[PDB]
From Swiss-Prot, chain A:
Family listed: Belongs to the HisA/HisF family.
Protein name in the entry: Imidazole glycerol phosphate synthase subunit HisF
UniProt pathway: Amino-acid biosynthesis; L-histidine biosynthesis; L-histidine from 5-phospho-alpha-D-ribose 1-diphosphate: step 5/9
GO cellular component, one term: cytoplasm
Keywords, sorted A to Z: Amino-acid biosynthesis, Cytoplasm, Histidine biosynthesis, Lyase
Disulphides: none
Subunit record text: Heterodimer of HisH and HisF.
Residue intervals passing through the bilayer: none
Catalytic activity: 5-[(5-phospho-1-deoxy-D-ribulos-1-ylimino)methylamino]-1-(5-phospho-beta-D-ribosyl)imidazole-4-carboxamide + L-glutamine = D-erythro-1-(imidazol-4-yl)glycerol 3-phosphate + 5-amino-1-(5-phospho-beta-D-ribosyl)imidazole-4-carboxamide + L-glutamate + H(+)
Keyword Cytoplasm: yes
The enzyme's E.C. designation: 4.3.2.10
GO MF terms held by the record: imidazoleglycerol-phosphate synthase activity; lyase activity
UniProtKB/Swiss-Prot annotation, chain B:
Entry annotated with the keyword Amino-acid biosynthesis: yes
Function: IGPS catalyzes the conversion of PRFAR and glutamine to IGP, AICAR and glutamate. The HisH subunit catalyzes the hydrolysis of glutamine to glutamate and ammonia as part of the synthesis of IGP and AICAR. The resulting ammonia molecule is channeled to the active site of HisF.
Name of the protein in its database record: Imidazole glycerol phosphate synthase subunit HisH
Active site: C84 (nucleophile), H178, E180
EC number from the UniProt entry: 4.3.2.10, 3.5.1.2
Main localization of the protein described in the UniProt heading: cytoplasm
Length: 252, 200
């Protein structure tokens, strides 16, 4: 069987890694290529670079990151964040990215999913889904969690697999900035509605949160927070999950 | 160690080239060249890579007149090594491109897998008969090889389907997974290919 994946999320602005929450205290945390190599060195399964470079320089800056990563990294990486049309995604994939992640542009145009999949295969297309509880319903938000789209998560996930997406990146808006663990109820919720691999995002803090995420039905668990600043040893975590039944990817 | 990677496509080939350059850094007199044309001398290691449609890439190899080349390396007992699409090309035909046949260096065919999630994608575990390290490699593929036991090299299961993720007919090697994306063991494997392809 296929391994459950542990994925490192590198937030990048201006070809640099950013740490913080608000851009008042967004500080430089280093080179993404060096940092990504370190994630591979320590056993992280996939990488995800999300770019929040200002709009004017976003397209150029994102292409430089992929090439600089593509020239040194030995694990799959996804690039996403502000990717609004096919040829922008074409640029990025041919420049080296294995998967491109779309959210806002995919809600505002489901067709965009099938475009990239038709030319690059489903495996190339990650759909980010930011979802929140609004009056007892799981709703999809866009514009970085700021616009209610009036679309139920339940209907969107089906459409998204229907459009030929290869993978869902599911962030719980009620759980970002939180360290109390993944939104497992939402993961449980999405799980019977799709066959796509689910990437849990938002809430991780200790090993056992990953066990909770995978119990709840995630195929992979994203996390920035923890791995640097050596809180959770990645191999520690991978052994811990192996111990309690998760089919991790373990290296002798 | 004169290493050749066929660079015509389809798909990304610079990953493999970079991974092959990485894995070869501790070997004496390594050269890695990107081959688009027939060269007059042969390579010790020729890689056939590629990601895509079986029919194309059997097009891009005949168009640039590389079947001759590839088959010469077989007879001159060099090491010929296919990866992802390139491994599939080593067999006679495929369900992906019906009337189109290719290379036929190994006796077999390529078929679509039986899973309803059929970009087989992620880290799955390869077990080898010999030589190459056992562990989890990164797959992204929809078609599998159909061949007879003696030519199997490594076996992996995806959704109850045991299938050949690696093959060998002498000095022909094929790998279904991408070892450039396989992290430490991906480099360990590539080095073992370079090693096998040394002594002759």
């Amino acid at each position: 069987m296929l391994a459950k994946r542990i994925i490192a999320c590198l937030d990048v602005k201006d070809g640099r890694v950013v740490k913080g929450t608000n851009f008042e205290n967004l500080r430089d945390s280093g080179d993404p290529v060096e940092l990504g190599k370190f994630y591979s060195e320590i056993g992280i399964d996939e990488l995800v670079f999300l770019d929040i470079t200002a709009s004017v320089e976003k397209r150029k800056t994102m292409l430089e990151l992929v090439e600089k990563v593509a020239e040194q990294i030995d694990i799959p990486f996804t690039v996403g964040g502000g990717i609004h049309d096919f040829e922008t995604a074409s640029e990025l994939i041919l420049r080296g990215a294995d998967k491109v992640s779309i959210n806002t542009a995919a809600v505002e145009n489901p067709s965009l999913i099938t475009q990239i999949a038709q030319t690059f295969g489903s495996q190339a297309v990650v759909v980010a889904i930011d979802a929140k509880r609004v009056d007892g319903e799981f709703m999809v938000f866009t514009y970085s969690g700021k616009k209610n789209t009036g679309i139920l998560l339940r209907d969107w996930v089906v459409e998204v697999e229907k459009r030929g997406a290869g993978e869902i990146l599911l962030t719980s808006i009620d759980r970002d900035g939180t360290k109390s663990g993944y939104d497992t109820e939402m993961i449980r919720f999405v799980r019977p509605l799709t066959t796509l691999p689910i990437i849990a995002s938002g809430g991780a803090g200790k090993m056992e949160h990953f066990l909770e995420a995978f119990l709840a039905g995630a195929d992979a668990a994203l996390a920035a927070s923890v791995f640097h600043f050596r809180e959770i040893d990645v191999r520690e975590l991978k052994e811990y999950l192996k111990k309690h039944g998760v089919n991790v990817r373990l290296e002798g | 160690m004169r290493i050749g990677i066929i660079s015509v496509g389809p798909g990304n080939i610079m990953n493999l080239y970079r991974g092959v350059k990485r894995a070869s850094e501790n070997f004496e007199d390594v050269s890695i060249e990107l081959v688009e044309s027939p060269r007059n001398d042969l390579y010790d290691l020729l890689f056939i890579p590629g990601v895509g449609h079986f029919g194309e890439g059997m097009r891009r190899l005949r168009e640039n007149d590389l079947i001759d080349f590839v088959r010469k390396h077989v007879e001159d007992e060099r090491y010929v090594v296919g990866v992802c699409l390139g491994m599939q090309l080593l067999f006679e035909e495929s369900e992906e491109a019906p009337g189109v046949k290719g290379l036929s260096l190994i006796e077999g065919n390529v078929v679509k897998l039986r899973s309803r999630r059929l970009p087989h994608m992620g880290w799955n575990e390869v077990i080898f008969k010999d030589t190459f390290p056992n562990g989890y490699y990164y797959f992204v593929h929809t078609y599998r090889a159909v061949c007879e036991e003696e030519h199997v090299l490594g076996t992996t299961e995806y959704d109850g389907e045991i299938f050949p993720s690696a093959v060998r007919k002498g000095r022909i090697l094929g790998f279904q997974f991408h070892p450039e994306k396989s992290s430490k063991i991906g480099r360990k494997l590539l080095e073992k290919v370079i090693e096998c392809s040394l002594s002759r």
